[PDB]
């Protein structure tokens, strides 16, 4: 039962693997979990990279906004 984003995301990944191997018409022939594993590792590394990039960009934008606010306060004081 789902209480976090992780169980949901695992459900998207398994459902997509099932739909993919269903429409490939593999039939009785076995389905390799290689696509599933590769997608999981790619998702892990890409979530880490995107979160780091978004944090860095948000920190830079916040620093610029703070500098602009300080300059505006100095201009209003003077």
């Amino acid at each position: 039962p789902i209480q976090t984003i992780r169980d949901a995301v695992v459900n998207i990944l398994i459902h997509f693997d099932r739909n993919f191997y269903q429409k490939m018409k593999v039939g009785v022939n076995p389905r390799s979990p290689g696509y599933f594993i590769d997608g999981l590792r790619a998702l892990v590394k890409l979530v880490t990279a995107k979160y780091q990039d978004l944090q860095e960009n948000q920190r830079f934008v916040n620093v610029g906004l703070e500098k602009l606010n300080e300059s505006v306060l100095k201009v209003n004081e003077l």
């Binding site: 459902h15 739909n19 590769d38 790619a42």
Partner: protein, 134 residues
């Protein structure tokens, strides 16, 4: 001079305000966009554009089903292709087709798997040779 600098940087301040407003939406949809892009890299190499759009329909249905929101105007080239790399590929010999750009991104963003190329025109040999040089 301070007033002139403020008037010049008002556009940058508005752009920063727009970025700060869109930061919440980006943080909300980051997990869904990462899911769709990783599924791109690990599934969509060996498919044509019709099958790619089909599994966009199924994948977006699954993201909307399990309450994970994504970008409505999402694109693989925009998400995982920089302008520097796009110009580098186009000047090294890659075609201007969006399908070829997506395939090139799949090829060049695969560091854990050895990429297999199906190029009946034998053009990607020259493209990757010009990309990597000597």
């Amino acid at each position: 001079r301070s007033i002139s600098l403020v008037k010049s940087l008002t556009f940058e301040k508005e752009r920063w305000l727009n970025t700060t407003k869109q930061f919440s939406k980006t943080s909300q949809e980051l997990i869904g966009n990462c899911i769709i892009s990783s599924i791109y890299e690990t599934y969509f190499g060996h498919l044509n554009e019709r099958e790619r759009g089909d599994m966009l329909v199924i994948l977006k249905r699954l993201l909307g089903k399990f309450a994970v929101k994504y970008d409505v105007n999402y694109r693989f080239i925009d998400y995982l292709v920089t302008l520097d790399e796009k110009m580098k590929w186009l000047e090294c010999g890659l075609d201007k087709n969006d399908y070829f750009l997506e395939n090139m991104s799949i090829v060049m963003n695969s560091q854990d798997a050895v990429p297999f190329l199906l190029d009946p025109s034998s053009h990607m040999i020259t493209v990757i040779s010009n990309y990597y040089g000597n």
